[PDB]
From Swiss-Prot, chains A, B:
It comes from Saccharomyces cerevisiae (strain ATCC 204508 / S288c) (Baker's yeast). This is Regulator of Ty1 transposition protein 103. Involved in transcription termination by RNA polymerase II and in regulation of Ty1 transposition. It is found in: Nucleus. Present with 3930 molecules/cell in log phase SD medium. Interacts with PCF11, RAI1, RAT1, RPO21 and RBP2. Coiled coil: none annotated. The gene is RTT103. It comes from the Eukaryota. Belongs to the UPF0400 (RTT103) family.
């Protein structure tokens, strides 16, 4: 029971996916980093490892891009919520100006009376 | 049980205050608007109403400014969370560049071998 904008309730969904993904993202990244360090043209399992590091690379690019998508999507929800808050703020600041300006009009009117 | 950044969990607090305030903010605003319409220098209760509309005005400016404060505070939490997400995104995009660039190095190495 957390009270939030709906756009922020929606953000909680792809953010959860984003958080749960993080393990696999960093894991696949290191699986590529290690494979990159071991790859040696002088070796006898080189051609096999060369094909493998391509599989690992593509698979790492896929999971990362999958994370980027959810990340970019979640960012737009944050930007949307931020715009809404800036609008409410802008309107509240408008109400403040009107009150002061109206009070100026009342004071002027109260002066010409005397 | 909503899974969110801590900065967004913190945002939920002053946003709740912000939502609960909204009734009193709009109510005091209309209490001023009505009082402004009724105020008449020709009237016989004018001087009394003139003092009253000043009380209402100040009280409306206070509750609005009180809402603005919580609003500006909540906005900075949104901006903070957004910056964090843009960083994670920027790092994920860095991992993507490195993988592609490393794979370029491996391919070049695999070519000079032949």
């Amino acid at each position: 029971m957390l009270v939030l904008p709906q756009k922020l309730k929606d953000f909680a969904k792809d953010y959860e996916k984003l958080v749960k993904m993080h393990h696999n993202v960093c894991a696949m990244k290191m699986r590529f980093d290690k494979s990159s360090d071991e790859l040696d043209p002088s070796s006898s399992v080189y051609e096999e490892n060369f094909k493998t590091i391509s599989k690992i690379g593509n698979m790492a690019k896929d999971i990362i891009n999958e994370s980027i998508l959810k990340r970019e999507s979640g960012i737009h929800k944050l930007q949307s919520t931020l715009d809404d808050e800036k609008r409410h703020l802008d309107e509240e600041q408008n109400m403040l100006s009107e009150i002061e300006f109206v009070l100026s009009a009342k004071d002027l009117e109260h002066h010409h009376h005397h």
